């Protein structure tokens, strides 16, 4: 068979030039799950201009400038994480793909996380002053606790270990932004910025698939390895998550300083840390008390 | 300003960690051409299942087995080129970007060239047999003349010269597929496979922008260089284009062997090679004789993509 004596271009480019290249074959595929995911993410295409964010203006004007600053800072910090994933993380996954279709799906992922970052800009353009926008960017650059999180993960993308890179790529949509996503759902539960929360739900519709898919592909690779190597990877995952939770807690306490929201946001974050672990095929160690989310906030998340 | 004392994440990851990272800023945009390009390519989003390719079955069934094989082979060859560009070429541009928005635009490009590759698959699904599809994949793998073309470009993508990578990136949508795109427009000028040509025009609506944009960013960077280095880069471009034209000629003569289309397709290719040079800010050396296209073919090439097919 032609497929077994040729390589995909990305394999040729970075791994093995001993054989000729094959064009992607969408008429006979290795993994049916790839077609399912491709169809879902492409049919879920959206742009922030299609949501009428201007209808949030009345409830935005109900919020004082401390709350407006918090929202702008929170979203600019999330923009940084999506910029990391769009420009480095998801594209780094292409060359480590198990299948041809996976290579194209990660290109979609990188683009759509781009759209996610773009959508916060749309929200800022509609509601914030130029100075509020600039202040938030200054604050993100100068916040060491914020910066520590992407600084810990980027090395896995630029290093040679495809499994560690995959774990980083799952952790970003699976965990790292949820502490910030707490804020819009907290607000929309109280009738504040309902249209912004519609953008957040379109973002999460994508991110939940990104986390699932990276976790699915992770499990396929690790299942082939020796028991000793599987244990080594499990240990790496739990150790890395433990570190990322430590950094996230420190950041969220600083982000929400004066507002009281940090401890609820941390529980909201840990609920998703559990879901991250579950999507890698591991069990969550976190208790119900540690992951408790208020019904009104959970209602916004699930809608 | 925060912008002048911070770096984008991709710069931090690969080139410079002396300063902290800045989030993309879509509110204060460095180059308005980025926003114009972003808006056009996103508004132009489409998927191949929206186009009714089943209406080509009557004209497809009129074609003999040789013509059906040629089309399947040609399109599978174009699929390979789009696979190279989606999985290697466009994403390699991201880390060499001049602006923040350019990083996101190349992510869009990589995805959409993925869709271009997907679209040939939808055509094959409707028109071709399993055997035709499999034969064409075998043919592409074993065709050395075909393979030589992407093999010439890939090393620039994985090497550390950003300008040479940029040129290779522009050469793909700007030149390399046109020898193949001659075929569907030759056919649709004779009333055959009309719905397939609608897909090709949607593909070209993207590729024309891809070539423009890479050429635009190339020109901005090379304008900052010394006259000597500008001369070195001009020489590299013409040398590389000369190599690629030689390889393209050899491949097209093999592809179209027995049909008599190779000389027309080569002129069609060289017309676009001249446009490739013009989009890099250079003068085309090719004559009107050498780039002559029939008006019935040019009318199919130059026709506007159908807005009905948009997502
Ligand atoms: Ca405004
Ligand atoms: Ca420890
Ligand atoms: Ca509290
Ligand atoms: Ca002829």
């Amino acid at each position: 068979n032609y497929y077994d004596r040729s390589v995909s271009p990305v394999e040729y480019a970075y791994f093995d030039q001993s054989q000729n290249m094959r064009a992607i074959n969408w008429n006979k595929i290795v993994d049916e799950k790839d077609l399912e995911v491709w169809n879902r993410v492409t049919q879920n295409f959206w742009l922030p201009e299609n949501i009428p964010v201007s209808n949030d203006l009345p409830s935005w004007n109900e919020l004082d400038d401390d709350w407006q600053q918090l929202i702008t800072r929170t979203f600019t910090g999330l923009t940084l994480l999506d910029t990391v994933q769009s420009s480095i993380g998801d594209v780094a996954q292409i060359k480590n793909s198990l299948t041809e279709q996976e290579q194209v799906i990660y290109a979609n992922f990188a683009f759509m996380v781009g759209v996610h970052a773009r959508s916060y800009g749309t929200i800022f353009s509609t509601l914030c002053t130029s100075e509020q926008i600039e202040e938030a960017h200054e604050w993100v650059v100068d916040n060491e606790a914020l910066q520590a999180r992407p600084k810990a993960l980027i090395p896995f993308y630029t290093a040679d270990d495809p499994l560690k890179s995959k774990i980083a790529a799952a952790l970003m949509p699976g965990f790292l932004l949820y502490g910030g996503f707490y804020l819009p759902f907290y607000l929309s539960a109280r009738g504040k910025l309902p249209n912004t929360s519609d953008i957040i739900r379109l973002i999460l519709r994508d991110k939940v698939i990104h986390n699932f898919y990276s976790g699915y592909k992770y499990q396929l690779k690790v299942a082939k390895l020796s028991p000793e190597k599987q244990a080594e990877m499990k240990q790496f995952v739990f150790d890395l998550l433990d570190k990322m939770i430590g950094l996230e807690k420190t950041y969220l306490h600083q982000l929400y300083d004066g507002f009281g929201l940090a401890d609820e946001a941390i529980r909201f974050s840990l609920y998703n840390a559990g879901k991250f672990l579950q999507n890698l095929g591991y069990e969550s160690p976190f208790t119900k008390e540690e992951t408790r989310i208020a019904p009104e906030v959970f209602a916004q998340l699930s809608a």
Side-chain angles (χ1 to χ4, degrees), chain A:
Chain A
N1 189 247
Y2 83 88
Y3 184 95
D4 299 320
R5 60 185 184 76
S6 56
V7 295
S8 68
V10 75
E11 173 162 12
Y12 178 95
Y14 296 102
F15 294 87
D16 186 352
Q17 296 178 201
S18 68
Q19 295 175 316
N20 287 357
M21 285 172 278
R22 45 177 149 84
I24 186 158
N25 191 345
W26 286 94
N27 305 283
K28 181 148 55 162
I29 64 165
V30 172
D31 191 339
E32 65 270 24
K33 192 66 66 173
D34 293 329
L35 182 54
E36 195 179 347
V37 170
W38 169 258
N39 286 334
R40 194 79 86 174
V41 303
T42 56
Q43 291 167 18
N44 284 343
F45 175 68
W46 65 279
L47 296 169
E49 285 82 357
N50 220 255
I51 300 288
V53 179
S54 66
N55 291 337
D56 286 352
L57 183 57
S59 65
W60 176 259
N61 292 342
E62 294 171 343
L63 303 166
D64 66 31
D65 53 16
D66 289 337
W67 278 100
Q68 292 181 358
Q69 179 171 83
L70 175 63
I71 294 158
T72 316
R73 285 172 174 184
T74 299
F75 291 166
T76 308
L78 297 192
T79 306
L80 175 63
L81 297 180
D82 288 340
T83 304
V84 168
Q85 202 60 30
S86 172
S87 71
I88 308 156
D90 289 336
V91 298
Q93 305 317 296
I94 293 168
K95 71 173 71 63
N96 297 324
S97 292
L98 286 168
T99 66
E100 297 175 336
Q101 283 72 26
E102 181 183 352
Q103 299 169 4
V104 194
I105 292 160
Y106 277 107
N108 171 274
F109 284 10
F111 165 57
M112 290 304 300
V113 184
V115 173
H116 304 165
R118 201 266 170 282
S119 74
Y120 312 110
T122 298
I123 295 161
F124 299 154
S125 184
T126 313
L127 302 179
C128 306
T129 73
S130 294
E131 289 78 11
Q132 286 175 312
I133 291 165
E134 189 165 6
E135 193 283 325
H137 279 284
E138 293 160 355
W139 187 83
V140 165
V141 168
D142 294 338
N143 195 282
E144 297 295 304
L146 194 162
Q147 295 282 322
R149 294 131 72 253
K151 285 178 179 200
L153 300 177
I154 285 165
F156 299 122
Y157 297 147
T158 57
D160 300 341
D161 191 309
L163 297 182
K164 295 180 178 175
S165 182
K166 188 60 62 187
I167 293 157
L171 190 137
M172 186 76 93
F175 171 66
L176 252 199
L177 289 82
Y178 280 95
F181 292 137
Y182 178 82
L183 178 57
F185 297 142
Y186 172 86
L187 290 161
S188 59
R190 292 153 179 75
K192 294 282 196 276
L193 310 182
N195 301 284
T196 289
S197 275
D198 295 325
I199 285 172
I200 302 304
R201 282 184 282 275
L202 289 159
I203 290 168
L204 294 176
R205 190 171 67 173
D206 299 334
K207 295 208 176 286
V208 169
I209 298 182
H210 298 182
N211 172 59
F212 160 79
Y213 190 64
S214 291
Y216 170 77
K217 296 290 182 163
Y218 172 76
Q219 287 178 252
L220 292 180
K221 285 202 173 177
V222 301
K224 299 172 189 181
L225 305 184
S226 69
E228 197 174 17
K229 286 190 170 168
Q230 288 189 42
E232 185 190 315
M233 293 314 305
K234 189 176 177 193
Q235 290 151 18
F236 169 86
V237 168
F238 279 84
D239 176 78
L240 177 56
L241 182 62
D242 182 51
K243 289 160 169 165
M244 296 310 296
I245 291 165
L247 298 170
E248 179 71 349
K249 283 172 180 172
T250 300
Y251 170 60
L252 296 177
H253 280 298
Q254 291 180 201
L255 177 60
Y256 296 120
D257 188 35
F259 294 88
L261 311 190
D263 62 325
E264 291 81 32
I266 284 158
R267 293 204 302 273
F268 189 83
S269 172
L270 291 184
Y271 176 69
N272 285 279
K275 288 163 66 170
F276 160 77
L277 287 174
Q278 289 164 355
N279 277 274
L280 298 184
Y282 304 126
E283 309 303 328
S284 177
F286 308 112
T287 58
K288 300 297 192 301
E289 179 256 290
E290 287 173 342
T291 59
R292 187 171 78 267
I293 301 164
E296 65 278 13
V297 173
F298 195 82
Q300 295 293 319
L301 176 57
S302 55

